[PDB]
Amino acid sequence: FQCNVPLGMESGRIANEQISASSTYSDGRWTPQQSRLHGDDNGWTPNLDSNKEYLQVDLRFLTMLTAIATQGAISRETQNGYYVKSYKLEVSTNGEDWMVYRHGKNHKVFQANNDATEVVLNKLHAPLLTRFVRIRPQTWHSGIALRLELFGCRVTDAPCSNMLGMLSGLIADSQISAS
Amino acid sequence: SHMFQCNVPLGMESGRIANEQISASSTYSDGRWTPQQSRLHGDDNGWTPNLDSNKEYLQVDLRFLTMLTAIATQGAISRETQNGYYVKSYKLEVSTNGEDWMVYRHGKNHKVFQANNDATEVVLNKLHAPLLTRFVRIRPQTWHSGIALRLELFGCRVTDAPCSNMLGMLSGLIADSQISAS
């Protein structure tokens, strides 16, 4: 068993309804639902280019996240290339409290895309328990544009013993940090 | 109606924790206060170290990965002298791997548990949240007359509880420490 499965952005297993954003570009051609990896109709772009903007996926089910893949997008209408160069990850299990994913105790800035087309895969140091995932762009080229895939496995849909071990492992790790 | 609960005695009183699983930094030089005598409600003294100091500890190897949720302690009455001894406060130190030890913490500081006020009565300390562990050390901080401990641990074995429940409990704990990081 391996907890690396595509969570359903490219396949459509993650429904349109599960994808939202802080805002979207005003012409309606850059909706959150166009943020699927390898999608051929632009991507997600906010109403404004800022680090306050984000793309949100509701995974519904309690999920171990192990990787993130991102692209930028090429504009269908203008043929300009846009891409996020670095982002933060923000997660929640309850939908009220949000944790910015951390390297130790610092915000983890993920190095993202160098062009509008190539997929860039970031593996997490360790699985991250979550239900909601926000990608928060920090730097970008020409403008914010995102396509996305999430990788891992569903907590109630993995072999019990493997998951039990994975979860025990994570709790032991945080305890080791407190040594 | 069968309701799993993670508050079960882990085996100090019952014998399920073997003599071999119990150890200490040291033991009283007359050999009458061994670690193996630190079982809750035991009538043959208790555990006492060679020296009375906060550097001394009683250790339980639980062997199996365990959720600790509660600690119960007593002091001890001496069979030989009829003197009463008891630990008044203690710190708790745990480990999952045997090498890295975490002192149980209340916020930023070491948690100092309030313990016994006599040699006979059981004082129960419930943990705010279940603690994953494999080894337990009780580190006495203060005492009356000298350090003597009897002990019980409460909780559940990780692989001995229903999967669904354990999956939820472990997820719960991770979600809680995530909330602590906002």
Short mmCIF file of C-alpha atoms in Angstrom, two decimals:
data_model
loop_
_atom_site.label_atom_id
_atom_site.label_comp_id
_atom_site.label_asym_id
_atom_site.label_seq_id
_atom_site.Cartn_x
_atom_site.Cartn_y
_atom_site.Cartn_z
CA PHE A 1 0.00 0.00 0.00
CA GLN A 2 1.09 3.57 -0.80
CA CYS A 3 -0.63 6.83 0.15
CA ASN A 4 0.05 8.80 -3.06
CA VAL A 5 -3.15 8.40 -5.11
CA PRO A 6 -4.47 11.37 -7.18
CA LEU A 7 -7.36 12.67 -5.10
CA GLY A 8 -9.58 13.53 -8.06
CA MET A 9 -8.84 16.95 -9.56
CA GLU A 10 -7.85 15.62 -12.99
CA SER A 11 -10.30 12.67 -12.91
CA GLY A 12 -13.30 14.72 -11.76
CA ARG A 13 -13.78 12.60 -8.62
CA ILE A 14 -13.50 15.96 -6.84
CA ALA A 15 -16.74 17.58 -8.08
CA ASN A 16 -16.99 21.19 -9.32
CA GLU A 17 -18.95 21.97 -6.13
CA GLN A 18 -16.00 20.98 -3.94
CA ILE A 19 -13.76 23.61 -5.55
CA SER A 20 -13.98 27.30 -4.59
CA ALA A 21 -11.75 30.37 -4.22
CA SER A 22 -11.41 33.73 -2.45
CA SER A 23 -12.36 35.36 -5.77
CA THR A 24 -12.28 34.86 -9.53
CA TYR A 25 -11.31 36.96 -12.58
CA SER A 26 -14.24 39.22 -13.52
CA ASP A 27 -14.84 37.90 -17.07
CA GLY A 28 -15.78 34.45 -15.67
CA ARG A 29 -13.21 32.64 -17.81
CA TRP A 30 -10.97 31.70 -14.86
CA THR A 31 -13.32 29.96 -12.47
CA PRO A 32 -12.08 27.67 -9.65
CA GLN A 33 -13.55 24.72 -11.60
CA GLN A 34 -10.97 25.25 -14.36
CA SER A 35 -8.11 24.53 -11.90
CA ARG A 36 -7.88 20.82 -12.72
CA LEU A 37 -4.42 19.52 -13.61
CA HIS A 38 -3.94 19.26 -17.39
CA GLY A 39 -7.19 21.14 -18.04
CA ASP A 40 -7.22 22.81 -21.45
CA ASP A 41 -9.40 25.85 -20.66
CA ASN A 42 -7.26 28.44 -18.87
CA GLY A 43 -7.12 27.82 -15.10
CA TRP A 44 -8.04 29.58 -11.87
CA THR A 45 -7.26 33.27 -11.53
CA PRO A 46 -8.45 35.59 -8.71
CA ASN A 47 -10.12 38.99 -9.16
CA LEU A 48 -6.84 40.60 -8.00
CA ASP A 49 -3.22 39.40 -7.89
CA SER A 50 -2.30 39.27 -4.18
CA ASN A 51 -1.02 36.87 -1.52
CA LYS A 52 -4.40 37.15 0.26
CA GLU A 53 -5.99 35.16 -2.59
CA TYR A 54 -6.41 31.37 -2.53
CA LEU A 55 -7.81 28.28 -4.22
CA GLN A 56 -9.85 25.97 -1.99
CA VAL A 57 -10.63 22.29 -2.32
CA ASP A 58 -13.13 20.62 0.03
CA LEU A 59 -12.05 16.98 0.11
CA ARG A 60 -15.16 16.19 2.22
CA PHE A 61 -13.57 13.12 3.75
CA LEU A 62 -10.75 13.10 6.27
CA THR A 63 -7.67 12.71 4.08
CA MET A 64 -3.92 12.25 4.31
CA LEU A 65 -2.27 14.67 1.91
CA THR A 66 1.20 13.60 0.72
CA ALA A 67 1.80 15.68 -2.41
CA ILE A 68 0.72 18.69 -4.48
CA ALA A 69 1.14 19.24 -8.22
CA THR A 70 0.64 22.62 -9.88
CA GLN A 71 0.67 24.25 -13.27
CA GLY A 72 0.00 27.76 -14.42
CA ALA A 73 -2.20 28.43 -17.41
CA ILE A 74 -2.14 29.75 -20.94
CA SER A 75 -4.94 32.16 -21.81
CA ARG A 76 -7.32 30.88 -24.51
CA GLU A 77 -8.30 34.43 -25.43
CA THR A 78 -4.90 36.21 -25.30
CA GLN A 79 -2.33 33.39 -25.37
CA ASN A 80 -0.41 34.97 -22.46
CA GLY A 81 1.29 32.65 -19.97
CA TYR A 82 0.60 32.97 -16.23
CA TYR A 83 1.99 30.95 -13.33
CA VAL A 84 2.46 30.86 -9.57
CA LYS A 85 6.17 30.73 -8.64
CA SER A 86 5.71 29.90 -4.94
CA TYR A 87 2.82 29.19 -2.56
CA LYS A 88 1.86 28.39 1.01
CA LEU A 89 -0.45 25.53 1.94
CA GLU A 90 -3.31 26.05 4.40
CA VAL A 91 -5.36 23.16 5.83
CA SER A 92 -8.35 22.49 8.09
CA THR A 93 -10.10 19.46 9.50
CA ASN A 94 -13.08 21.27 11.07
CA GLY A 95 -13.63 24.04 8.49
CA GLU A 96 -13.22 26.74 11.17
CA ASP A 97 -9.58 26.57 12.27
CA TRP A 98 -6.86 26.86 9.66
CA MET A 99 -3.23 25.84 9.93
CA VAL A 100 -0.60 27.13 7.51
CA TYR A 101 1.54 24.06 6.75
CA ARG A 102 4.85 24.33 8.50
CA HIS A 103 8.47 23.40 8.11
CA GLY A 104 9.18 22.86 11.79
CA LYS A 105 7.30 25.93 13.06
CA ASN A 106 7.91 28.28 10.09
CA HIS A 107 5.50 28.69 7.19
CA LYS A 108 6.54 26.31 4.47
CA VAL A 109 6.95 28.19 1.20
CA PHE A 110 6.73 25.69 -1.66
CA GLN A 111 8.71 26.46 -4.79
CA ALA A 112 6.20 26.09 -7.63
CA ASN A 113 6.24 26.77 -11.41
CA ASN A 114 8.89 28.19 -13.77
CA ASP A 115 6.50 28.21 -16.75
CA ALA A 116 2.77 28.04 -17.57
CA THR A 117 2.75 24.40 -18.76
CA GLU A 118 5.09 22.04 -16.84
CA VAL A 119 3.71 20.09 -13.87
CA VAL A 120 5.70 20.66 -10.65
CA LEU A 121 5.32 18.07 -7.92
CA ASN A 122 5.92 18.87 -4.27
CA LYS A 123 5.99 15.88 -1.92
CA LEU A 124 5.33 16.62 1.74
CA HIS A 125 7.95 15.61 4.30
CA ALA A 126 5.20 13.67 6.05
CA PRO A 127 1.46 12.99 5.45
CA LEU A 128 -0.86 15.82 6.48
CA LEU A 129 -4.27 15.16 7.99
CA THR A 130 -6.90 17.39 6.36
CA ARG A 131 -10.39 17.89 4.90
CA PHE A 132 -9.82 21.29 3.28
CA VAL A 133 -6.86 22.49 1.28
CA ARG A 134 -6.02 26.07 0.36
CA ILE A 135 -3.23 26.95 -2.05
CA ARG A 136 -2.07 30.49 -1.23
CA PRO A 137 0.13 32.00 -3.99
CA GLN A 138 3.05 34.06 -2.68
CA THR A 139 4.88 35.00 -5.89
CA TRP A 140 3.90 34.72 -9.56
CA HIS A 141 4.79 35.55 -13.13
CA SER A 142 2.59 38.03 -15.05
CA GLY A 143 -0.39 37.01 -12.88
CA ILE A 144 -1.85 34.32 -10.64
CA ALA A 145 -2.98 31.21 -12.53
CA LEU A 146 -3.39 27.73 -11.10
CA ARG A 147 -4.06 24.21 -12.15
CA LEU A 148 -3.79 21.62 -9.42
CA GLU A 149 -3.74 18.00 -8.32
CA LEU A 150 -3.66 16.65 -4.78
CA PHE A 151 -2.20 13.33 -3.75
CA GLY A 152 -2.64 11.04 -0.78
CA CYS A 153 -5.26 8.68 0.59
CA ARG A 154 -8.57 8.79 2.44
CA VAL A 155 -8.26 8.01 6.18
CA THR A 156 -11.33 5.71 6.24
CA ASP A 157 -10.33 4.15 2.91
CA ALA A 158 -6.87 2.70 3.54
CA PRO A 159 -5.91 -0.59 5.19
CA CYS A 160 -6.59 -0.07 8.90
CA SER A 161 -3.16 -1.21 10.15
CA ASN A 162 -1.28 0.97 7.62
CA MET A 163 -3.37 4.01 8.57
CA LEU A 164 -3.14 3.25 12.30
CA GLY A 165 0.65 3.14 11.88
CA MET A 166 0.79 6.26 9.72
CA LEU A 167 -1.27 8.22 12.32
CA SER A 168 0.71 6.81 15.27
CA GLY A 169 3.93 7.72 13.44
CA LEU A 170 2.82 11.34 13.04
CA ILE A 171 1.88 11.75 16.72
CA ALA A 172 5.20 10.19 17.76
CA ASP A 173 7.02 12.69 15.49
CA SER A 174 5.46 15.75 17.14
CA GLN A 175 6.28 14.25 20.54
CA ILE A 176 9.91 13.82 19.38
CA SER A 177 9.97 17.54 18.51
CA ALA A 178 8.98 18.22 22.13
CA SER A 179 12.22 16.55 23.29
CA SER B 1 -24.35 -0.83 23.92
CA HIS B 2 -20.83 -2.34 23.95
CA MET B 3 -19.02 0.95 24.36
CA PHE B 4 -15.30 0.91 23.93
CA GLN B 5 -13.53 3.16 26.41
CA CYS B 6 -9.86 4.00 26.66
CA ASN B 7 -9.66 4.04 30.47
CA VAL B 8 -8.75 0.43 31.19
CA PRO B 9 -6.13 -0.54 33.84
CA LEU B 10 -3.07 -1.50 31.79
CA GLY B 11 -1.92 -4.21 34.18
CA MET B 12 0.03 -3.00 37.22
CA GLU B 13 -2.48 -4.33 39.78
CA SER B 14 -3.57 -7.33 37.68
CA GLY B 15 -0.09 -8.65 36.82
CA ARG B 16 -0.61 -8.14 33.06
CA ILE B 17 2.43 -5.86 33.21
CA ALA B 18 5.13 -8.43 34.05
CA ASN B 19 7.80 -7.87 36.72
CA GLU B 20 10.31 -7.73 33.85
CA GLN B 21 8.52 -4.69 32.38
CA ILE B 22 8.99 -2.66 35.59
CA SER B 23 12.31 -1.00 36.41
CA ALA B 24 13.79 2.06 38.09
CA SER B 25 16.79 4.38 38.22
CA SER B 26 17.66 2.66 41.52
CA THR B 27 16.17 0.75 44.46
CA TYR B 28 16.48 0.82 48.28
CA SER B 29 19.72 -0.89 49.35
CA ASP B 30 18.01 -3.44 51.66
CA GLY B 31 16.30 -5.02 48.61
CA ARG B 32 12.83 -4.72 50.14
CA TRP B 33 11.51 -1.94 47.88
CA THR B 34 11.99 -3.27 44.37
CA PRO B 35 10.33 -1.74 41.26
CA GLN B 36 8.20 -4.92 41.05
CA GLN B 37 6.57 -3.89 44.35
CA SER B 38 5.09 -0.68 42.89
CA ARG B 39 1.78 -2.31 41.94
CA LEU B 40 -1.36 -0.46 43.03
CA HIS B 41 -2.90 -1.99 46.18
CA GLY B 42 0.11 -4.11 46.89
CA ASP B 43 0.69 -5.05 50.46
CA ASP B 44 4.42 -5.50 50.42
CA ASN B 45 5.79 -2.00 50.66
CA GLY B 46 6.31 -0.25 47.32
CA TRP B 47 9.11 1.03 45.11
CA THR B 48 11.74 3.17 46.77
CA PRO B 49 14.97 4.40 45.15
CA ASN B 50 18.44 4.27 46.72
CA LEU B 51 18.42 8.07 47.26
CA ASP B 52 15.55 10.50 47.78
CA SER B 53 15.84 12.95 44.87
CA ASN B 54 13.88 14.34 41.90
CA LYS B 55 16.38 12.63 39.56
CA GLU B 56 14.99 9.21 40.55
CA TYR B 57 12.18 7.50 38.61
CA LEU B 58 10.04 4.40 38.22
CA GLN B 59 9.75 3.04 34.68
CA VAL B 60 7.16 0.87 32.97
CA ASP B 61 7.85 -0.71 29.59
CA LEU B 62 4.34 -1.21 28.23
CA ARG B 63 5.95 -2.98 25.21
CA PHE B 64 2.92 -2.32 23.00
CA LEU B 65 2.00 1.09 21.65
CA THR B 66 -0.44 2.47 24.20
CA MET B 67 -2.79 5.36 24.79
CA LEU B 68 -2.29 6.61 28.34
CA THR B 69 -5.30 8.54 29.73
CA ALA B 70 -4.86 8.28 33.50
CA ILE B 71 -2.34 7.66 36.30
CA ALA B 72 -3.21 6.43 39.79
CA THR B 73 -0.62 6.49 42.59
CA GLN B 74 -0.28 5.51 46.22
CA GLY B 75 2.44 5.81 48.80
CA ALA B 76 3.52 2.83 50.91
CA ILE B 77 3.55 1.61 54.50
CA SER B 78 6.71 -0.24 55.56
CA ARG B 79 6.24 -3.86 56.64
CA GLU B 80 9.50 -3.68 58.60
CA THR B 81 9.11 -0.29 60.37
CA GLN B 82 5.43 0.66 59.88
CA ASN B 83 6.65 4.03 58.59
CA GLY B 84 4.55 5.73 55.94
CA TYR B 85 6.13 7.20 52.83
CA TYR B 86 4.53 8.96 49.84
CA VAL B 87 5.23 11.09 46.75
CA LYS B 88 3.45 14.46 46.93
CA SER B 89 4.05 15.61 43.35
CA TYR B 90 5.55 14.08 40.21
CA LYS B 91 6.46 14.81 36.61
CA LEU B 92 5.62 12.38 33.81
CA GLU B 93 8.11 11.43 31.07
CA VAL B 94 7.15 9.30 28.05
CA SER B 95 8.73 7.69 24.99
CA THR B 96 7.55 5.81 21.94
CA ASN B 97 11.02 4.69 20.72
CA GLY B 98 12.98 4.18 23.95
CA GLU B 99 15.56 6.83 23.06
CA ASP B 100 13.67 10.12 22.80
CA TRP B 101 11.95 11.16 26.02
CA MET B 102 9.26 13.80 26.29
CA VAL B 103 8.37 15.33 29.65
CA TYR B 104 4.58 15.85 29.79
CA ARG B 105 3.87 19.57 29.45
CA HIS B 106 1.16 22.00 30.60
CA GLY B 107 1.45 24.82 28.09
CA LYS B 108 5.14 25.80 28.09
CA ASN B 109 6.13 24.24 31.43
CA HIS B 110 6.54 20.68 32.68
CA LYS B 111 3.29 19.44 34.10
CA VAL B 112 3.64 18.95 37.86
CA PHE B 113 0.92 16.50 38.89
CA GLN B 114 -0.52 16.75 42.38
CA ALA B 115 -0.17 13.34 44.01
CA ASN B 116 -0.63 11.77 47.45
CA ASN B 117 -1.28 13.25 50.90
CA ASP B 118 -0.93 9.88 52.68
CA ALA B 119 0.56 6.41 52.16
CA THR B 120 -2.71 4.48 51.56
CA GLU B 121 -5.22 6.45 49.45
CA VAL B 122 -5.32 6.23 45.65
CA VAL B 123 -4.99 9.61 43.94
CA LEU B 124 -6.16 9.56 40.32
CA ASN B 125 -4.85 11.97 37.66
CA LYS B 126 -6.78 11.93 34.36
CA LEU B 127 -4.89 13.33 31.38
CA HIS B 128 -6.58 16.18 29.53
CA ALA B 129 -6.08 14.18 26.35
CA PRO B 130 -4.95 10.59 25.61
CA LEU B 131 -1.17 10.32 25.28
CA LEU B 132 0.52 7.95 22.85
CA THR B 133 3.32 6.05 24.46
CA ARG B 134 5.30 2.86 24.95
CA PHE B 135 7.22 3.71 28.11
CA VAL B 136 6.16 5.60 31.21
CA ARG B 137 8.41 7.25 33.77
CA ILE B 138 7.04 8.66 37.01
CA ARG B 139 9.51 11.25 38.35
CA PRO B 140 8.77 12.21 41.97
CA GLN B 141 9.35 15.89 42.68
CA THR B 142 8.30 16.18 46.33
CA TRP B 143 7.64 13.59 49.05
CA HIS B 144 6.93 12.95 52.70
CA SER B 145 9.52 11.01 54.76
CA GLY B 146 10.91 9.39 51.60
CA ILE B 147 10.00 8.33 48.07
CA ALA B 148 7.63 5.36 47.87
CA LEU B 149 5.32 4.56 44.95
CA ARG B 150 2.58 2.19 44.08
CA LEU B 151 1.04 2.74 40.65
CA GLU B 152 -1.56 1.99 38.01
CA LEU B 153 -1.81 3.18 34.43
CA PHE B 154 -5.00 3.56 32.47
CA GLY B 155 -5.85 3.72 28.79
CA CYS B 156 -5.91 1.29 25.86
CA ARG B 157 -3.62 -0.65 23.57
CA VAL B 158 -3.59 0.83 20.05
CA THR B 159 -3.90 -2.53 18.23
CA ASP B 160 -6.31 -4.00 20.82
CA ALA B 161 -9.11 -1.47 20.28
CA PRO B 162 -11.67 -1.38 17.44
CA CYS B 163 -10.06 0.09 14.31
CA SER B 164 -12.76 2.70 13.68
CA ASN B 165 -12.47 4.06 17.23
CA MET B 166 -8.68 4.18 17.28
CA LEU B 167 -8.59 5.78 13.83
CA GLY B 168 -10.90 8.48 15.22
CA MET B 169 -8.99 8.97 18.47
CA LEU B 170 -5.60 9.28 16.67
CA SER B 171 -7.13 11.64 14.09
CA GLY B 172 -8.68 13.61 16.95
CA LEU B 173 -5.31 14.12 18.64
CA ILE B 174 -3.58 15.20 15.42
CA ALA B 175 -6.45 17.61 14.65
CA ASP B 176 -6.12 19.09 18.16
CA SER B 177 -2.36 19.75 17.88
CA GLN B 178 -3.09 21.34 14.49
CA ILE B 179 -5.59 23.72 16.15
CA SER B 180 -2.86 24.59 18.70
CA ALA B 181 -0.81 25.76 15.71
CA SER B 182 -3.90 27.87 14.79
#
